[PDB]
Structure formats: structure tokens, C-alpha cells
Write a protein that binds this DNA or RNA. Structure first.
Lengths: 92, 78, 97, 104, 99, 84, 94, 108
DNA sequence: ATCAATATCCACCTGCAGATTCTACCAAAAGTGTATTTGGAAACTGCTCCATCAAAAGGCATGTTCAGCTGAATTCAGCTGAACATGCCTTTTGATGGAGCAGTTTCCAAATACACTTTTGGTAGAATCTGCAGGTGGATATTGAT
DNA sequence: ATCAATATCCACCTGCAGATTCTACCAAAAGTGTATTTGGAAACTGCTCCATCAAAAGGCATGTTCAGCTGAATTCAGCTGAACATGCCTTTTGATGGAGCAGTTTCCAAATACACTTTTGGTAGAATCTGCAGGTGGATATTGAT
């Protein structure tokens, strides 16, 4: 079994555009995009923990890495979304 | 086989790159540049193929070769 | 006998191919090229056809982008004609040379 | 009931956790890290799909295709910079003719 | 005479002189002030190891020198000898700095 | 505690001239100097932005050489000689 | 105390092997330390990716070799492969 | 108890095989590390060091100096095609540039 | 631009087939509970090195004057590259065989992990050694003539 | 058109800041013993890639005509380089207060570990829906002639 983000991309698409669809090639693009940004964020957070002699990647490393990788307003909204989702997850 | 990259294919590429007028020397020059590019990308791709002990260059081998050359390509596995 | 003036068909072609996304090199001659170059490393390698297609997308996107830079170099020299020297400047500044 | 639903997200928090755990990134992965990373990935995906669906409705399509993704990426300053070294296959280029090349 | 070199002669001499050497070409205290001003607008009350200021200055000078080389080639390309803003812009656009 | 402003003008016309010389330039338009100050301010802002992000993440108040080296490397401008 | 490790002594040893009457300034030694750390991280991270791509949990000399072949520009690669192979076999002969 | 031999002496190396092994093992490159990986890696790092130091020492001799400085490292890196490619995105602090004046700028 | 004639572009349909969803099953993954261990935050502090201030000198920025020569603009033609007709052929489309290559599946020797103990190689700091910065001022090369 | 003026080259010399050597303590390799993990050898498939081959669709090669672009030539205003005086402000060397970097200690909130238990996403046929073929012909744009 080979996994991908297809179903998740699809669900986000039905959030932001309920009537719009997406072709198979376009979903391959989106999948590559998710994989790309994942490896960028993770590998930057890994370097961040190394430089600071910590064995753990926490949301603090993910947030700093987002601040180094995304350009300006994308970074600000991404930090907002990550903080929101963590706060809503801890509450349970 | 390089000459199979024809003058009109090269014109088509230049048109998409917005070029309106083209010197007669460009085609040969283009064929040189293309050749170097391909030799680089296939070289490393083959190297991934060889490390995996395969003899089928896969799409992912190409993706990795393009990536370590700073030329990330979407739609083929990453 | 009706004739378009020089450049008019060229502008027409720019509009068409900038609106489109199809590959502009024919499949078989490029697959032949890929297999020759590759054979210059280990003969009789197989290729997944999606691997040949990945190579082609990479190659055409690279040549198209290079032609956009070459075009800016030609225009910088008060010209509308791309010349090998424009390709050369573009690649030197890109760090390809 | 899953962590994704718990955090308000469509992207899979569990999968993202397993992928950090197994990616040779660090010895340990904190509990908030994959929640936060999944949220970031969902957000960027929504931005892209928002713009690409917009571009597909301005060309009056109902199916997003790679071309709409390229139009969405390149016409948006921050996304174009974030993805400045990315080739989208079958994406083409923006229509763009240098003014000096036009007639008259 | 009164002796006077022709325009260009003293600049060619200066190219040879500075391409032979490696000293920082920007005054040190003003560059440090620049670094502290920029950094303080991002987080008040940073200090700097002086090592960090010299690393910033090496990086900046090597960047400007490299860009000026590329700018020079752009000027030569348009059959000029004098670099102009449009040459810097062409260079930075082709580098992908601001395409 | 005194106020830092306008320090981009410490990058003078003569210093810019020297840098162009090292870069091979023989003749310089009068508009180059403000252009160069703009390009340098942007470059140095980007580098320092990231170096301070590393400084903050480490809960320090002192930018180290290593923070600067990490920022330069993140941005494709690896610098040798300042790792100690 | 504050003990700081570094490649300086090994760089210096190699210096004495290739030029026995030549020294090196501390700034030049900092360049060489930077270089060693840099090439190290490129090879180790490419080898990590190689093990990960093929679903292996171990970095071996094979991953190091193919990383060297992907990273080094040609004759450098060839001679680096020779020295690495030589040292490995010499090592395994105890 | 057997006499101790460093892994470096065993591999015939000057670079530190055991330090390379620990750095591999604590770098989060992979769960485990093969015995021969730090030897090969240390070998390659020593070889590249020898190459650079060879060319930079020649450049110091040419400049009538006995101490290598960053300028000598720059001269060697940029005058060598393969080193210049390998280090194509690196700044050598205090390195300077190579003497180069475009033909069209020389007096006519 | 006015205008008629000519050529290509393109909004507009309508079906059908090729993709995109329903139906449905199931291992692998995700979650939940419990038992543990532990990395890193808090607190506390020595002591490196950072910020700041000053003097004194003299390097280098600044501001001016002026004309050499460069960029800009213009004119013109030689010749190169666009457009086109024509007629040939390469590539597309697609079908057929079948080999051999990926790609899982266990079994297990061989390799790597990891704690404890012992044995140096490597670092810090002190002590010693020594290029060469940086000051000489002739020796030679280049420049730009009146 | 040798000659004056200027700059660079190159060799000299010696103290001292910086480099090299040495020395002793100790962190961390190395050895040793044992537990755990793994990746290859043998084996069993079944997608999947190449080697054929052919008909006709388009797309390319070639040769001619000429529009118009590139490049040479020429002119000239005025910007930018070169050379000067002045004196600011950087550099240097130095001394000093103290921020905070870093080195250590305790000890829990937050992590890993392991056993079960549900859930889900992948998968793949079958059943039901946008998008390309591709008709157009009808605008839209271009062109030579006034």
C-alpha cells in the first residue's frame, strides 16, 4: 500500500471550494507540495534541535522553522494556525 | 539523436519563453545546453538506480536527481 | 497573395504557446536522446515511462526559463533577437558558468 | 475521536507524527509538534486550493488542473517566492510579452 | 605639467589594486552601526559577538563584489563601460533575487 | 542608550566605489550609490532577520557568529571561517 | 572549562604531510574546519537520504560511496572513492 | 587485555575515525551506522583536505610566504575547476577575488 | 487610423468515453490504557567578553572645479531571419508477445548496539619560537605629453 | 617622443603579535562481553518494459522572397573621473562595569514502551458523471491600398 495526502487535500478542497473538483495530475502536484513542505519544515526543525543540543523536536522548533521558511504573511498565518490547533488539541 | 531536437521544437520553446526573433546560431547552442543538462540529470538518476541495485530508472530516481540539483519537480512522487 | 509581416506570426505563436502547457519537443526523439545519454553510463538500462516524462518536463521547463532570461539579455542590449551571446550571459549570471 | 479531529484539522496528525518519528529528525517527538506541523500543511494547502479554484473559475472551469495551480502559484508573491525553485509539470508559464516586442 | 591622468587610467589602477588584496572595503564602525540598527528594529537590546559582526561584513562585501561583477557583464553586454541601475536590476532578476 | 538612525549612509560613495573596483567595474553611473545601499539593506535585513530568529529560539540576547553562519547557510550563502 | 573539539590537529597533520615546511594562520585553519564540517554534513545527509529511500536503517560505506559520487565533481569523486575503499579494506583486514 | 589500536591507525588515516563515528551516530542520520561508514567518510574528508592544502601551499610558495592564509585558500579553490565547482556557493572569509579585468575595459 | 478582403482565433455547442465517484473489504496503522523513565526548565552563579567611553592621530570622506570622453540619439544599408509553399517522412497510436525484473516472503548467521572498565589521544593553557607587517626608498614600468 | 612625472614593484630589515610546541589532566575512544537487529540467500510470483510491426496523422525540411533589424558610422551635450584642500570621525589602544553566557543541580511534566483494540485509508471493481473531440462558422485582427 502506497499512501498519499489525497483524501486530506480533497477534504480541504471541499472546505474552500465545495463545487470545484481536481484532476488526478493536479492532485499529484498537491501531494508533491505537501511532501516538499513537510521535509523542509522537519529538516529545519531537526537542525534547530541539534544546534541547541536538544534531543526533542517540539512545536517550538516547528514554529521557529516555519518562521525561517515561510515569507512574511504566510509565516504569520501559519504560526497562527499551528498555535490554534495545538491549543484546541491540548484542551482535550 | 540530439538533432532530433528540431529547429521548430526549439522555436516552440523560445515562443513559450516569450522570444519573438531568433538567430540562426541559437539552435546548435540550445542543443549544447540541453545536452549538458540531460547528462547531469540522468547521471545522478542512474546513480540512484545503481545504489538501489536496480536497472530500471524510476520516476523517483529522476525526482531525486533533479532535487539534489536544486530543481525540484512536482507531480511524479515529490 | 496574402502575407503576414515579419514578427506578426511570431507574436501569435507566443500567445498560443504561453497559453498552453503541452510538451513542445516530440516524445520519440527526446526518448531516443535520453536513452543514448543514459547508455553512456550503463547500457541497456530500463526506464519507467513516467521517468522519461519527468525528464521531459524538467528539460522543457529549464529551456523555457532559460529562454526567458536570454530574452531579457537580448532586450537589455537594445535588441529583439536572441543570440548565443545572450544565452551565455544568462547562464554565466545563473552560476551555470 | 482521533487527534486530527481533536485539533480541528483535516490533515492526519497521526501520520505526521509517525513520519517525524521515522524520518531521522530527532530522538524524540513532542506531542504538540505533529499537531502544529499538520496545521501548517493544511493551511498552506488551503491557500493554494483557494487561489487555484479562483483561477479555475476565472477561466470558467470547475475542475482544478495543474495549469490553475501554476497560475495560482506564480501570480501570488509570497507563494511564488516560497516555491521559487519548483517546477509544476504541465503548468506552463504566465502569459507575458515584453512591451518592446509589441507592434506600434 | 600640471600632470593629469586620463579618465579611466586611475580606475584601472584601482581595479588591479583592490583585486590583489582582501581587506574589508567598508569602514568597520559604520558597518557595525548599520548592523546594530537593523537588528534592533527586530528585537530591541540584542548584543553581538564582534565575531558575528565581522561574519556579516564578510558576507555582505562578498555579495556586493559578486553582484558588481555580474552587473559589469550586463553593462558590457549592452556595449557600455558604465554600470547603471538597469544593469544591477538585470543581474538580480537573472539571479532570482527579485525576478 | 542613543538612537541609531540613517546608518545606511555610512556605506559611502567611496566605499561603494572600492567594492565595484574589486568587482572589476571601471566606470559608475551616479545613480548606482543609492541603488547599492538599497540592495545591501535588503540583503542584510534578510540575513539578520534569520540570525535573530536563531538567537531567539536559543533564548539568548547575544547574536553569535554561529547564528549568522546558520542564517547565511539557510539562504544559500555558506560562509567559511567563523565556526571557531 | 568549556572544552571545544575541532579538526585543527588533523588538518595540521595533513599539512605537515603535504608541505612539511609550511604553516597556517588561525583564520586559514578556521576556513579548513568550516570546509571539513561542511563536506561532512553534505555526505552524511545524502547517505541518510539514501538509506531512507531504500528502506534501510543503517548507513554503511556503500551509502557513503554513492553519496560521494553524487556530491563530488568527477576526478575528485574517483580519487575519493579510491581512498575510502582503500581505508575500509585496510581497516577490515584488522 | 589486548593492546589498543585506534581505528584511524587501523585504517591508515590521520583523520579521527572514532570521532567521525560518534558524530554520525549522534547526528540523526539513521538508526544505526555500519563499522566501515566512519572509516570511508574520514578517508574522503582527509583526501579533500590534502588536495586543498596542497594547492594552497603551492600558492603560498608562489607568493613567497611560508604560512597559508585565506587568500591562498581562495587562489587554490578558484583556480581549480573541480574545487571551485564543489565550493561554488561558499564564501572564503578574507579570500578576495581572482584578478580579472574584462578585455573591453583595457586602454585601446 | 478609413476600408475591404483574407486569415486565424475562439466562444459555443452536444455527446461519449474516459475519468472521477459508489460499494465494499481489510491489514496496517492509529488510539487508548498503563507502566515507566528522563530530557530539559528552573534556579543559581562564576567569569568571559560585550558595551561604552576617551584620547590622540592621521586616514579617508566630503566638497569643489572642470573637460575627456562616454552614452544617447540619429541615419542608413547589408544581409539575416520570418513567412510561406510544397512535398516528403517521422512520429503517434496501438496492439502483441514474453522475459526478466522488481518486490515481497521467511530464516538466520553476521553485524551493530550498548554498559562497564581501562587506556590514551586531544584539549587548554603556558611556554617558546618566528614569519612577516609595515616601515624603509631605490629600480623599473607606464603614462601622457607640450 | 625621449622626457618628466608618477606609480608600482621588489628587496631590504627587525620586534612582536601571532603561531607552534609542549605538558599534564581527563573525556572519550577502545576493549570486552552480550543482546538485539538486519539484510541478504533462496523462492515465488505477477506487473511492466522492451522488441517487434504497421497505417495514417500531422509535422518537418527545403528553397525563395523580401521586411526590417543589427550594426557601423557619426555627432554632441553633459556626466563622471581625476585632482585638489580641509577637517571629521574612524581606528587604535586602553581601561572598566557588569550582562548574560555558560556550567551545574534537582526533579517533574512530558516523553517512550508495550499490550491490546478499533478505525481508516488504500484498493479495486463497478456504476455514474466533466471534459476533450472537434463541428464550427462567426468575430477579431491584420494587411495593402488609398
Amino acid at each position: 500500500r502506497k499512501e498519499s495526502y489525497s483524501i486530506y487535500v480533497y477534504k480541504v478542497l471541499k472546505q474552500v471550494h465545495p463545487d470545484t473538483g481536481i484532476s488526478s495530475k493536479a492532485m499529484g502536484i498537491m501531494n508533491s507540495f505537501v511532501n516538499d513542505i513537510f521535509e523542509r519544515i522537519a529538516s529545519e526543525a531537526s537542525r534547530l534541535a541539534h544546534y541547541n543540543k536538544r534531543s526533542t523536536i517540539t512545536s517550538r522548533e516547528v514554529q521557529t522553522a516555519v518562521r525561517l521558511l515561510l515569507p512574511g504573511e504566510l509565516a504569520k498565518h501559519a504560526v497562527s494556525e499551528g498555535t490554534k490547533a495545538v491549543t484546541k488539541y491540548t484542551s482535550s | 539523436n540530439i538533432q532530433g531536437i528540431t529547429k521548430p521544437a526549439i522555436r516552440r520553446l523560445a515562443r513559450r519563453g516569450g522570444v519573438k526573433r531568433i538567430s540562426g546560431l541559437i539552435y546548435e547552442e540550445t542543443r549544447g545546453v540541453l545536452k549538458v543538462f540531460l547528462e547531469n540529470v540522468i547521471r545522478d538518476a542512474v546513480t540512484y538506480t545503481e545504489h538501489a541495485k536496480r536497472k530500471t530508472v524510476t520516476a523517483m530516481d529522476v525526482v531525486y536527481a533533479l532535487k539534489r540539483q536544486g530543481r525540484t519537480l512536482y507531480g511524479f512522487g515529490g | 497573395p496574402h502575407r503576414y509581416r515579419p514578427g506578426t506570426v511570431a507574436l501569435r505563436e507566443i500567445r498560443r504557446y504561453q497559453k498552453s502547457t503541452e510538451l513542445l519537443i516530440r516524445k520519440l526523439p527526446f526518448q531516443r536522446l535520453v536513452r543514448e545519454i543514459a547508455q553512456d553510463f550503463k547500457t541497456d538500462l530500463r526506464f519507467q515511462s513516467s521517468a522519461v516524462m519527468a525528464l521531459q518536463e524538467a528539460c522543457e521547463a529549464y529551456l523555457v526559463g532559460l529562454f526567458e532570461d536570454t530574452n531579457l539579455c537580448a532586450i537589455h542590449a537594445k535588441r529583439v533577437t536572441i543570440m548565443p551571446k545572450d544565452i551565455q550571459l544568462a547562464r554565466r549570471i545563473r552560476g551555470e558558468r | 475521536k482521533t487527534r486530527s479531529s481533536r485539533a480541528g484539522l483535516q490533515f492526519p496528525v497521526g501520520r505526521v507524527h509517525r513520519l517525524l518519528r521515522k524520518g531521522n529528525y530527532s530522538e524524540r517527538v513532542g506531542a504538540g509538534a505533529p499537531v502544529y506541523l499538520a496545521a501548517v500543511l493544511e493551511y498552506l494547502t488551503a491557500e493554494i486550493l483557494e487561489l487555484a479554484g479562483n483561477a479555475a473559475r476565472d477561466n470558467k472551469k470547475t475542475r482544478i488542473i495543474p495549469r490553475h495551480l501554476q497560475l495560482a502559484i506564480r501570480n501570488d508573491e509570497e507563494l511564488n517566492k516560497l516555491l521559487g525553485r519548483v517546477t509544476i509539470a504541465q503548468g506552463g508559464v504566465l502569459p507575458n510579452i515584453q512591451a518592446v516586442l509589441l507592434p506600434k
